[PDB]
Structure 1
Amino acid sequence: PQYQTWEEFSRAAEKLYLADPMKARVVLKYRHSDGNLCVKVTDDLVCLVYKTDQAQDVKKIEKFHSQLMRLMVA
Structure 2
Amino acid sequence: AQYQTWEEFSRAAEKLYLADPMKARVVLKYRHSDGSLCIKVTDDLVCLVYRTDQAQDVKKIEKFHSQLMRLMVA
TM superposition score normalised by structure 2: 0.92
Q: Structure 1: 5+ residue runs without aligned partners?
A: none
Give the 4+ runs in structure 1 shifted more than 6 A.
Answer: none
Alpha-carbon displacement from aligned partner over 1:18-67 (angstroms, at most 9, x marks no partner)? 10011011000000100111000111111111112311111111000111
TM superposition score normalised by structure 1: 0.92
Q: Structure 2: 5+ residue runs without aligned partners?
A: none
| Percent of aligned pairs sharing the same letter | 96
- Taking the aligned partners of 2:53 and 2:28, their CA distance within structure 1 comes to 13
Alignment of 1:1-74 (within 5 A): 2-74=2-74
Number of aligned residue pairs: 73
- Contact 1:24-1:44 within 8 A present in 2 as well: yes
CA RMSD of aligned residues (A): 0.9
